[PDB]
Amino acid sequence: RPRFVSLRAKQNMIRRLEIEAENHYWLSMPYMTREQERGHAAVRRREAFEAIKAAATSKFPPHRFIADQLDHLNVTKKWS
Amino acid sequence: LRNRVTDRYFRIQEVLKHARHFRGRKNRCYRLAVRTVIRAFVKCTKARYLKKKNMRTLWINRITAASQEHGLKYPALIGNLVKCQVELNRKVLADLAIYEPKTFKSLAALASRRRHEGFAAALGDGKEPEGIFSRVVQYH
Amino acid sequence: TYSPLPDDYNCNVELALTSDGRTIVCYHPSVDIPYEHTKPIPREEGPMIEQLSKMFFTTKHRWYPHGRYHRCRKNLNPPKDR
Amino acid sequence: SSFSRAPQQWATFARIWYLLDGKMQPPGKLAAMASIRLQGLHKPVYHALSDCGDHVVIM
Amino acid sequence: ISRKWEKKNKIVYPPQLPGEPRRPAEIYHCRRQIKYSKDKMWYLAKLIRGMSIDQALAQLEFNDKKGAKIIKEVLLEAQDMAVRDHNVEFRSNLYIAESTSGRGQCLKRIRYHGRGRFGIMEKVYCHYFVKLVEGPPPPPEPPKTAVAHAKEYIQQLRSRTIVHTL
Amino acid sequence: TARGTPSRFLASVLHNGLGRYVQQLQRLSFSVSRDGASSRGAREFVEREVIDFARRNPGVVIYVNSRPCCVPRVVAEYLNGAVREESIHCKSVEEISTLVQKLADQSGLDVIRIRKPFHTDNPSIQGQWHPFTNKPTTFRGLRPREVQ
Amino acid sequence: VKKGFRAAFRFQKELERQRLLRCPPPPVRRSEKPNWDYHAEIQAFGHRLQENFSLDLLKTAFVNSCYIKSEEAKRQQLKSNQELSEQGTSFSQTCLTQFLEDEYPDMPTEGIKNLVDFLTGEEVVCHVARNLAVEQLTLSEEFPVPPAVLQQTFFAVIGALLQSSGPERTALFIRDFLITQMTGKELFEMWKIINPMGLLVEELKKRNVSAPESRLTRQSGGTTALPLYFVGLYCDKKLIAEGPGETVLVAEEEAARVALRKLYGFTENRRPWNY
Amino acid sequence: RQWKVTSEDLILIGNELDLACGERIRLEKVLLVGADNFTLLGKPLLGKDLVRVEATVIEKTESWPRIIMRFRKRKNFKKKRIVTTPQTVLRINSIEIAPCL
Ligand SMILES: [Mg+2]
């Protein structure tokens, strides 16, 4: 069956198009140039990756405690 | 029969208790009860959305009735109250309409006052000072 | 002379803003009914269901009985609010 | 306000009689008005299960 | 098997105080393992429900169903034991408060069919139960009047609350 | 489900908050066992927290009965006659403390579906709406199409 | 047979529960059930109500005369609560009268008396005692405690509170536990009246006002089986009160009731009680 | 949420409030205060000096067990969960207004 476009649908599409046109405008004016931006975030990016690597390589089984082992004896703790 | 189940009575009852108020064998036979009880629980879970949806629909209908009693339309009432910065929700508006007719008439009067203040601004846009009730309180 | 709504019914509404303009006062005293707007006090199953339907402007269907199933499902001690 | 419970409920849920004059009126608009009144959608206490309909007499 | 109906006659109530209404006598009787379908016996039971003992006997004496004779014998025995043992003053002052038929212990037999196939006949047996209560039969429930119908409708209208609101 | 369950309306016991707040819980009864892992938590609760709870809630009479039992229990009896029995079987000290505090703070009314989240005995101050509110009156109260 | 014990025990428990539900045992006073200590219970009663009762007075209040008679009869094979109950009843009546007269100065003496009678009646006081646990601590020769005995014990408790803490604390107690019982109630729900139109005529005569004229303000479906009539009472062409009804007579009666409520200041939208 | 409230009213908040039972509280976001003959509307909130709504934590409870069941046909997909939402019943003691207009 055929489908037809209503004025509401046209208005919705036009609203989206206006938003996208404003997006075009605001993207049309960069702050820095590419040569200016080159390398300006290298230190932070390297530190972030170093943190990721440290987290990846710090994976190791957790400690085990005599207190944890012995506390199970309390299951038969009673009143004298 | 080393290991044989002995709780099957209670396992069946856990479902039959919920099935007790059904019609026909669905309330007695477990094979039939379990299928309908699962459907009942699924419907109960999904009905929490429809309860909220219908409450707003009921509130909107009641507010429409109350506003039409004063010659207003629901969109006008709601929009103009918002423009006046009265943040009463639809539940409260319907409650006021049912139980506080005078307060609801006052609110409808405010909405119509704003709706006419709005129109005067549109006609003589610019020079005209903002309407008394059109002035917006600023928060910082 | 402008009135936000007709003042004849249910109260006389008067809107206002406080001097600060941050709160809205509504004065809505109820309007009494004028004395002149009042009047002085004056001084078989088939046929039965038809009569009841005519009386209460309903249909025949609600006057027929229901089965024991429904009559016993009905809650005889419903919760009461207010 | 200040009514007893039964009189208050009776007043709230009473059904009113409305009169429409169909002379030169569109049957569709007449029907819209009559349907609103019959359903009771013109009452703030409206609910589908409250049987809050009113009487409409169209001449 | 269950035999609670017979035991129901052995319950002894405490003596009644002088300022207490006279408790009507109740007699529980039954016949077990009647060669008759419980479905067919149910019609006779329903027929005699709520009727006086004499009216029930009269109705059963002129019924062509085999179960009618059995029910008549059971009712006569119930009357006799009510007078002899349950201290019922008048034979005729009894009405059938309860009368039902129950499934009995049935036997399975083979019914031969045409092509070497078969069915499982059931030699159906049924129980019959009666409770006889002393006193005139309770009056039949009068039909709902228009006044009562209107009263119920108006009560339903008055019961309406403003739903889903304050 | 709601349809397969009783329901009630939001309510108090005796208008519990109007004049003064009266703690509805009145009795606690802890059946605990000297021996048995099930009641280890109950025993620790009786040793450490029960006295503090008793002095914090002076209006609640707390009975502690040490008898052989496989499932230690706490029976809470409220002023309105409600009796709620909760098993403290294999519950830790903190779990028992939270359960007992919940019982103390809770009212005797049944824990079932509540139809409305609110309850007003006077829902209307300006007069409940009726069909004739907002309807203007007419001279001599003449109905429409009335000759006189 | 299936080996095991836990399922059998559970089924026995369920059978016991079902048997109890089908044939619940006759009610027994809480004193005869396990986990009962009378001294602890009475102290907790006082602490719950947040009042410094004197234990001897409270015990004397809780003990009834019929209990003493039954105890003596049993012993064959104590100070009753009579005076405390009398003092409590007298003080409660006077204090409720003072409260109601202060709140509703226009209410007639008959109306105030009827309101006090409702608040101190068997039903209201019995409900309050039951939900305050007075019945549990009440010593009586039969259970459940009859409403008369429960009311007497409750007023004995009030008298003990009076003797312990004083009139001010007792008045606060009464305000908290009896004045609250008229919240949500209607004036003529509490004070039953007959011929409200006649009573309103009498009140207007006392106020030196001509008899009101009953007039039909609004009506609907007059000839149907579900009519609505609004009847307004007019004082010299001034509406004093209008009421709805099914018939004109019922509407007029309800309008008279509304007028009485407005005159006595017990309107539905009246100022709340102050706590 | 917005609650239409009056003295002696009961309100059921669907969460624990971290308040002891019987503790008195002031409700501060009062959008509207109304009487028989007048109403005051905030924009959107009335000032503290104008209205003083006071409540009391009358009870702390858990809601009745709510069932959350998921089911998809012919997928062996069936799940059940029971949730008891914490709740607090508040009683509104008084609503006071002051001549600060
Ligand atoms: Mg053959």
UniProtKB/Swiss-Prot annotation, chain A:
A GO cellular-component term linked to this record: mitochondrial ribosome
GO process terms (BP): mitochondrial translation
Gene: MRPL57
Protein name: Large ribosomal subunit protein mL63
UniProt signal peptide: none
GO molecular function ontology, one term from the record: structural constituent of ribosome
Keywords: Mitochondrion, Ribonucleoprotein, Ribosomal protein
Subunit structure comment from the entry: Component of the mitochondrial large ribosomal subunit (mt-LSU). Mature mammalian 55S mitochondrial ribosomes consist of a small (28S) and a large (39S) subunit. The 28S small subunit contains a 12S ribosomal RNA (12S mt-rRNA) and 30 different proteins. The 39S large subunit contains a 16S rRNA (16S mt-rRNA), a copy of mitochondrial valine transfer RNA (mt-tRNA(Val)), which plays an integral structural role, and 52 different proteins.
Record localization: Mitochondrion
Family: Belongs to the mitochondrion-specific ribosomal protein mL63 family.
Main location: mitochondrion
From Swiss-Prot, chain C:
Cellular compartments annotated: Mitochondrion
Glycoprotein is among the record's keywords: no
Main location: mitochondrion
Keywords: Mitochondrion, Ribonucleoprotein, Ribosomal protein, Transit peptide
The keyword Mitochondrion appears for this protein: yes
GO terms (BP aspect): mitochondrial translation; translation
Any one GO MF annotation of this record: RNA binding
Coiled-coil zones: none
GO cellular component terms, semicolon-separated: mitochondrial inner membrane; mitochondrial large ribosomal subunit; mitochondrial small ribosomal subunit; mitochondrion; plasma membrane
Subunit record text: Component of the mitochondrial large ribosomal subunit (mt-LSU). Mature mammalian 55S mitochondrial ribosomes consist of a small (28S) and a large (39S) subunit. The 28S small subunit contains a 12S ribosomal RNA (12S mt-rRNA) and 30 different proteins. The 39S large subunit contains a 16S rRNA (16S mt-rRNA), a copy of mitochondrial valine transfer RNA (mt-tRNA(Val)), which plays an integral structural role, and 52 different proteins.
Homology family: Belongs to the mitochondrion-specific ribosomal protein mL42 family.
Protein name: Large ribosomal subunit protein mL42
Species of origin: Homo sapiens
Gene behind this protein: MRPL42
Residues of the full protein shown: 35 to 142 of 142
Swiss-Prot record, chain D:
Protein source organism: Homo sapiens (Human)
Superkingdom of the source species: Eukaryota
The protein's name in its UniProt record: Large ribosomal subunit protein uL13m
UniProt record similarity statement: Belongs to the universal ribosomal protein uL13 family.
N-acetylserine modification, residue list: S1
Quaternary assembly: Component of the mitochondrial large ribosomal subunit (mt-LSU). Mature mammalian 55S mitochondrial ribosomes consist of a small (28S) and a large (39S) subunit. The 28S small subunit contains a 12S ribosomal RNA (12S mt-rRNA) and 30 different proteins. The 39S large subunit contains a 16S rRNA (16S mt-rRNA), a copy of mitochondrial valine transfer RNA (mt-tRNA(Val)), which plays an integral structural role, and 52 different proteins. Interacts with OXA1L.
Cellular localisation: Mitochondrion
Residues passing through the membrane, by range: none
From Swiss-Prot, chain H:
Entry's localization field: Mitochondrion
Domain of life per record: Eukaryota
Family: Belongs to the bacterial ribosomal protein bL21 family.
Subunit structure: Component of the mitochondrial large ribosomal subunit (mt-LSU). Mature mammalian 55S mitochondrial ribosomes consist of a small (28S) and a large (39S) subunit. The 28S small subunit contains a 12S ribosomal RNA (12S mt-rRNA) and 30 different proteins. The 39S large subunit contains a 16S rRNA (16S mt-rRNA), a copy of mitochondrial valine transfer RNA (mt-tRNA(Val)), which plays an integral structural role, and 52 different proteins.
Name this polypeptide is given: Large ribosomal subunit protein bL21m
Organism: Homo sapiens (Human)
Gene: MRPL21
